[model samples]
Target: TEYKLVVVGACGVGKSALTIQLIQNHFVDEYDPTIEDSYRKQVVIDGETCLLDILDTAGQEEYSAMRDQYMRTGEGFLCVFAINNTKSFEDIHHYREQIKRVKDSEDVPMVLVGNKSDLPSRTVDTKQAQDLARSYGIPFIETSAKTRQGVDDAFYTLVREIRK
Candidate 1:
């Protein structure tokens, strides 16, 4: 199957960092908020292959205009938050609500991703993030883009749920 995945989160929450790593298998320059990019990559999970067309908008102001269309088109979502930025973490509630509104239903195949696990300190506690995901009954994951820890697992988890 061909799945459309959208990366949605607050600005500077490492949305592009995670997306670029998943598709390009590498990191890029600084957080560039002005660009909207899509990548198509073949990924295999559980001995099955599927194509993922990932759309990343960086959650910038201008990109907000297109999110509705993107959200409607996406079969899976990565609702990301930066653990080091409380505001970014706080913004995830809005993202979750917006995703539900856009998807027009509950229990959407999504994951709450707390990014920057490699950082020394974090404003968003892991338990709080986990609790929030528990509230939504969705899976939660922490990832370090700098070290690529849990990065693939995040995407793989969503893809698995979407497939299910």
Candidate 2:
């Protein structure tokens, strides 16, 4: 099965870092604003061959024009935010709202991902993140693309959501 996964978040939230880590298995140290990029990877997850068609997009509002087009086509979404930045956490609501609006369904296959979990300092508490995902009826995962922690789980979990 092919999963059309879209990664979205606020500026500087490590959206590119997470996608790059998953696709390339390397941490991108630079803060590069992604305009749009498509990547494909095939792997066996849960005894099933899965092809990931991932779309990495701009987090900055200046490239906001492309959001709706991608959002409409995505099968699942990874709503990412930095744990150390409360503003980034809040910005996720806009992305989530837009995805639901574009999809015209509240039961969208999505995951709430908290990135940069390797850092000791965090402005957004784990409980707060869990509760938000709970209310949205989606999985919440903490990932550190820098350390490669829970990165696969975040993407794999969204695949599971799409299957369900």
Candidate 3:
């Protein structure tokens, strides 16, 4: 089954990075953000073919009404943030709640991603990033689009969540 994965987060928070990082098995960190587009590629997981209809959006979406429309369509979301930027980490609760508010469901499928694993997961407060994801009951992933660490696995986890 083809499902939606809306890559939502603050601007410059590696949303596009994770999308491309997960898409290519060759592990290319190079990506062109100027081109507006939706990517279509079939992913094989557990002998099943899953198509990821990824809608990469502008985190600073001009209007919330227009943004909510995008949120409503997605079956899942990859709410990513940069571990290096603590402000990006702070915005996770905002986006998480926004999806709930927009979709009008208390439960929404989302993965809390802390990108830039090359620098390591160092946040001043919050008892580590993994703890926050655990509390939310969502799959937590720390990835490096630069080194290509845990990129594909993030998508795999998303597909697994959708399947569950």
lDDT of each: 0.85, 0.89, 0.77
- lDDT, candidate 3, 1-116, per-residue tens: 89787888877777777777667645454556554457777988887988988877664444567767866888888888887788998888988888888878766787888888
lDDT of 1 by residue, 119-145 (tens): 998888999999999999999999977
Q: List candidate 2 stretches off by more than 4 Å.
A: 59-67
* Model 1 stretches astray by more than 4 angstroms: 29-31, 59-67
Q: How high a TM-score does candidate 3 get?
A: 0.86
CA lDDT of 118 in candidate 1?
Answer: 89
Best-to-worst order by TM-score is 2, 1, 3
Which ranges of candidate 3 are over 4 A from the true structure? 26-36, 124-126
Task: Give the C-alpha miss distance for residue 107 in model 2, angstroms.
Answer: 0.7
TM-score of each: 0.92, 0.93, 0.86
Output the TM-score of candidate 2. 0.93
Expressed as tens digits, the lDDT of each residue in 108-155 for candidate 2 is 999999999999999999999999999898999999999999999999
* Candidate scoring better on lDDT of 1 and 3: 1
